């Protein structure tokens, strides 16, 4: 289930005409390009070494698109100010997500095009890639405007065409690195909790991709147990743990299991004194 996304952001700045604009491209949830308007002279830059096999023409063409998007978001922010009847002395945020999911048979599985204003759903292209879901009264103005102009056809063309073709290009060009996994390294720690009770904490460290499943079992039955959100280690890998409160002396009846696509075999761990 390969994917490509572009996550874009414009933040207006009170007293300045130009918002800050930032675009980030992803393949399979990993950053591979980024554009930032606040840079010295802004360009799309490669965020993964395999992208450096793209030539000057590619970077120049992508950068000109960003310059376009930057203007597009500026006008849109000003329009939104009108629709919501807001004041110009504040900061406001416009975000966009777009891109595609590709199956193993190279069929487009889903196309995405979504906007948010002030961190709330504004308008989105439906799964049919033909019609719009507007989330509030203001967004209906945009919907009408975009239905009038046939905007959806433009995005459909991109999603069904360039998005899937270029993602395949990238998969081909970056295959080895794009398919690389890191296995989780797991261990169990033991902590006092209260009288008669202790905490077992099952750790998974150093894994990639971020997707993972941690489970606790009593005898051989699964449980429900504190589970932290998966978090970046800062070195390209991820961490997670799952803990359970168990009665003193029953620690050996509890077993942790770790499931990750990077492992050659699911892990089964117990607390080891």
């Amino acid at each position: 289930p390969h994917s490509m996304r572009y996550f874009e952001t414009a933040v207006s700045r009170p007293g300045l005409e130009e918002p800050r604009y930032i675009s980030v491209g992803y393949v399979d949830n990993k950053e591979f390009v980024r554009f930032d308007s606040d840079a010295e002279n802004p360009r799309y830059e490669p965020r993964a070494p395999w992208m450096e096999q793209e030539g000057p023409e590619y970077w120049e063409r992508e950068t000109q698109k960003a310059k376009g998007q930057e203007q597009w978001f500026r006008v849109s922010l000003r329009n939104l100010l009108g629709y919501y009847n807001q004041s110009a002395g504040g900061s406001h945020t416009l975000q966009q997500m777009s891109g595609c999911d590709l199956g193993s048979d190279w069929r487009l599985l889903r196309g995405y095009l979504q906007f948010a204003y002030e961190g709330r759903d504004y308008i989105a292209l439906n799964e049919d890639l033909k019609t719009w879901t507007a989330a509030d009264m203001a967004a209906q103005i945009t919907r009408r405007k975009w239905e009038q102009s046939g905007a959806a056809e433009h995005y459909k063309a991109y999603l069904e065409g360039e998005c899937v073709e270029w993602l395949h290009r990238y998969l081909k060009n970056g295959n080895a690195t794009l398919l690389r996994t890191d296995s989780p390294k797991a261990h169990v720690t033991h902590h006092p909790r209260s009288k008669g009770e202790v905490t077992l904490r099952c750790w998974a460290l150093g894994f990639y991709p971020a997707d993972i499943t941690l489970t606790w079992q009593l005898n051989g039955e699964e449980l429900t147990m504190e589970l932290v959100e998966t978090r970046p280690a800062g070195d390209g890998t991820f961490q997670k743990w799952a803990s359970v409160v168990v009665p003193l002396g029953k620690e050996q009846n509890y077993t942790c299991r770790v499931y990750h696509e990077g492992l050659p075999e699911p892990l089964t761990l117990r607390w080891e004194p």
């Binding site: 376009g68 504004y122 945009t142």
Partner: peptide
């Protein structure tokens, strides 16, 4: 391959 948006909001 970045997207180019059509008409503004």
């Amino acid at each position: 391959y970045a997207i180019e948006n059509y008409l503004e909001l």
